[PDB]
Structure 1
Amino acid sequence: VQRIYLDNNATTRIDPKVKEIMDPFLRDHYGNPSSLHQFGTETHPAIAEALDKLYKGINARDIDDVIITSCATESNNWVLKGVYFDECLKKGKNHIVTTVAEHPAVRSTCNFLESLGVEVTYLPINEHGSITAEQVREAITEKTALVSVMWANNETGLIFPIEEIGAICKEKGVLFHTDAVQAIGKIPVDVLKANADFLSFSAHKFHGPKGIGGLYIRSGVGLTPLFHGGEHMNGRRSGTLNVPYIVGMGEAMKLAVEHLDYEKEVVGKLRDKLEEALLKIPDVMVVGDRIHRVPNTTLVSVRGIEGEAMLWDLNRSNIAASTGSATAIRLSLSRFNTEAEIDKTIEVFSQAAVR
C-alpha cells in the first residue's frame, strides 16, 4: 500500500534526523541530568545545545527562559493558572482577554477561571476570519491581568497580528501571551518583535516527538509554578528531565526554522496547488482569509456533504485529513508531502465528492 498524510496540524512525522539524535539517550546516556556524577554530567552538553537551538528558534535572549514542559497544553494551563494567582488574586486584576478561536487548552482553562470568578472576554471572530489589534485595545479594561492570542489558528491556518497586539500590550502595561503552536516552523517566530511575555509550543507539530513542549518566559516576568517541587528548570517547572525529547525538540526546532524558506515556497505552493485545484469543483469554497495564513493549511467546505463523510471516504483511499468548524475539511501539508501526492489527492477528493 501507499498512503498520503495530510493531517499535519493534528500531529507530524518525527523527522528521521530527530529520531536519530534522540536514540543515544534511549540507549546508553540514560542518566538523570540532575545527578552530579558521570551519568548526569554526560547529558549536559547535548541538553544545552538542544536548549540553544530552542532560544535561537524563537529569538529568545539569554536573559529570558525557555522552559521545557510536557506539551503546549501544559504551557497553556501554566500561563493562565499562573497569572491567576500572580495577577488575578494577588493584584486584584481580575480580567483576561482572549479569543474564541483559541485552542481548548486556552479556552477550557479560562472557562474554569471564570468559574473561580474571573472575567474573561472571548474576542469575537470577524468575517476576515481574524481579530484586529483594536478589539484587544478595547476590551483591555484595567482589571486586565493578561492578553492571550494564538499566533496562528490550528483549524484555518490564519495568522493573527501579533506584533501589533504586542505593542498595544506594552503601551497598556498588560501581560501578553501567544500560543504559537501552529507558527513554529510554519512562519518566522520572533518573541522580541512580538513583545510577548509568554509563548507556548508543542514539539510534535514540527517534526518533534509528541509529549514535549516549551514555554518562553521574558527577562523578569514571574509566573507561579504549575509543577511545584522546584527542582528543575531554575525552580519554575519541576520533574525529572525528558532528556531524549529535549534533545529531539531541539533538533526538531532547528530543522523547522531551517526549512522556513522551503515551507513558504514549496509547501505553500503545494497547498496552493491543492487548494486552487479543489475549489474548481462545484460549491466548494475555502474558509477564512487566504492571504494571512501559514503556508501548509487549507480549510475547505463541500456544501451539501458534511466533512465527517469526506474524511471517512478519503481514509478508505489512504488519505488522512481532519475536521474544521465553519464542519469543513482540514488539509494540512508538511515538508514531506510531494506534488505526486497532491495531484493524487485532487483526483481522489473530486471522485469522492461526486459519489
Structure 2
Amino acid sequence: AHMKVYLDNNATTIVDPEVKAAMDPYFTQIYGNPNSLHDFGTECHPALRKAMDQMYEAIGARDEDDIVVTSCATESNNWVLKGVYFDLIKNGDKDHIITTEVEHPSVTATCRWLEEQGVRVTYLPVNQDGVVEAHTVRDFITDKTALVSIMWANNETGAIFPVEEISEICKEKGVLFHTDGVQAIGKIPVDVIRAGVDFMSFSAHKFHGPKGVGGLYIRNGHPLTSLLHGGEHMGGRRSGTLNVPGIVGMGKAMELATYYLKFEEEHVRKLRDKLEDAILEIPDTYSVGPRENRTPNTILVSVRGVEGEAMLWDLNRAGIAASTGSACASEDPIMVAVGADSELAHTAVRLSLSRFTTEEEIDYTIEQFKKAVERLRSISSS
C-alpha cells in the first residue's frame, strides 16, 4: 500500500541518530560560551577540538590549513567570492572571475551582484558529460582574473568535475581556485591537497549533519577579508559565538560519512544502479550524464511526453519525494545538463538516494514510477 519514501537527499538529508545523540548534550547540559574562561565555557572545549579534528581528517586537510565553521555553504560561497572581489578587485589589480552556468544559486546570484559591481565574470557553458573541462578555464584565464570557482560535483546531475586538473592549471597560471564541494562529501573521496584547491565549501545537512552549520576550507591560511567582523572567533576569520551543537554534529557526521563511503559505497551504488536500470527499461526514457563519472546516489531521468513537474507531483501523491533538474535535447539523441535560464530547457525528475535507503523503498519506487509514467502518458497530448 501507500509508503512514504525519501529520494531528495541532494537537497537535504536526515540527521543520523548518532549525530543527533552527539549533539544532544550541548543545548541544556553543556551550554557555556566557549570564549569564556570559567569552567562552564571551557567544558565543551574537548568536544570542539574533537569535532575540528574529525573535519580535518575527513577532508584530509593539514595543520597549516584553516577550516572556518560557517552557518551554511551559502555563507561560505558568499564569503569566498565577495572576499576575493574585495581583496584583489576593489583593492587589487584584477577584475575577472571564472565559474560555470550550472553552479548553485549561492554562487550564481553572488557573481551577478559582483557583475553589478563592475566585475567581469565568465560563466563557462557545460558539455555533454555535464562537466567543464580544464582546458576551457585555461583558455579563459587572463592576467586580471582573480578567482576560478567551479563546483566539485553537480547537485542536479551528479556529474563529478575534474578538480585536480583545473587546480593544476590554476596554480600554473597563479590564480586562486575555489570549489563548491557540498555534493562531494560522503559521495566521493575528498582530499583537499590532492585536489589542489585553495578554498572549499561544504554543508553539514547534506551528509546527515544538522541544518544551520557549514564550513569553508582555506589552504595554508590564505588571507581572506572576513565577512563577519567582531570578536576573534575562528582565529579572527569569522566572528559570532560558536554553534557548538552544529560543530559537534558536523564533525560526527563527517567522520561517519567518510566511514560509510570507505566500507559501504557498494550498497548505495547497487541500489541506485538497480533503480536506474529499472527506470530506463521504460520506453523513451533517458538518464542524463554518464554514470561512470556520476556520484553513486544520483539519477536524473527525463521522460518523454510527460513533464518533470507532473511526474514529481504524481510521485509525491504516491509518497515518493524527488526533485527537479534542468536538461536539454541534443544529438550524438541524448538529454544533457543545461543552465536553468535556457529557453530550450525542460525539467527532468531527480532522484537521489542515501545510506538510509532500503531495497523495499527501491522496489516500491520502481513500481510507482512505472505506474506514474503510464498514467501520465495516458493523458498526454503526445
Secondary structure (helix, strand or coil) at the match of 2:78 reads: helix
- State the 1:262 CA deviation: 4.5
The question of whether the paired residues in 2 share the 8 Å contact of 1:263 and 1:334 is answered with: no
TM-score by length of 2: 0.92
Q: Return 5+ residue gaps in structure 2 as ranges.
A: 328-346, 376-382
- Structure 1: distance between partners of 2:225 and 2:264: 37
Corresponding residue of 1:329: 349
The residue number in structure 1 matching 2:70 is 69
Amino acid at match of 2:359: E
Task: Give the counterpart letter for 2:148 in structure 1.
Answer: V
Q: Which runs of 5+ in 1 are unaligned?
A: none
CA deviations 1:135-162 (Å, max 9, x no partner) are 0101111101000010000000000000
Q: What amino acid is the match of 1:337?
A: T
Task: Tell me how far apart the structure 2 counterparts of residues 277 and 261 of structure 1 sit (CA, whole Å).
Answer: 27
Are positions 1:349 and 2:369 aligned together?
Answer: yes
The CA deviation string for residues 195-227 of structure 1, in whole angstroms up to 9 with x for no partner, is 111000010000001111000011141100111
SS of alignment partner, residue 200 of structure 2: strand
Deviation larger for 1-10 or 158-167: 1-10
CA distance in 2, matches of 1:126, 1:187: 21
Residues 129 and 159 of structure 2 are in contact (CA less than 8 Å); yes or no, is this contact kept in structure 1? no
Distance 1:289 1:150 in 2: 17
Q: CA deviation at 1:126?
A: 1.2
Task: Normalising by structure 1, report the TM-score.
Answer: 0.98
Equivalent position amino acid for 2:93 in 1: G
SS in structure 2 of the partner of residue 185 of structure 1: coil
In the alignment, what sits opposite 1:273?
Answer: 274
Report how far residue 339 of structure 1 moved.
Answer: 1.2
- For 1:129 and 1:197, the matched residues in 2 are separated by 23
Tell me whether 1:231 sits opposite 2:251 in the alignment.
no
Q: What CA distance in whole angstroms lies between the structure 1 residues aligned with 2:265 and 2:191?
A: 17
CA distance in 1, matches of 2:262, 2:9: 18
User: RMSD of aligned C-alpha atoms?
Assistant: 0.9
Tell me if structure 1 keeps the 8 A contact 2:3–2:318.
Answer: no
Residue 2 (structure 1) shift: 3.7
Match of 1:208, SS state, is coil
Name the counterpart of 1:166.
167
1:308/1:323 contact within 8 Å kept: yes
Distance 2:51 2:315 in 1: 38
Would the aligned equivalents of 1:98 and 1:147 in 2 still touch at CA under 8 Å?
Answer: yes
Whether 2:270 is the aligned partner of 1:250: answer no
Deviates more, 1:286-295 or 1:233-242: 286-295
How many corresponding residue pairs? 355
Q: Which residue of 1 aligns with 2:10?
A: 9
Which amino acid in 1 is paired with 2:248? V
Match for residue 316 of structure 1?
A: 317
For residue 127 of structure 1, give the secondary structure of its aligned residue in structure 2: coil
More displaced 10-residue stretch of structure 1: 259-268 or 72-81: 259-268
Mapping for residues 161-310 of structure 1, pairs under 5 Å: 161-310=162-311
Cross-structure match for 1:340: 360
How much has 1:311 moved relative to structure 2?
A: 1.1
Q: Please give the alpha-carbon distance, in whole angstroms, between the structure 2 residues aligned to 1:189 and 1:252.
A: 15
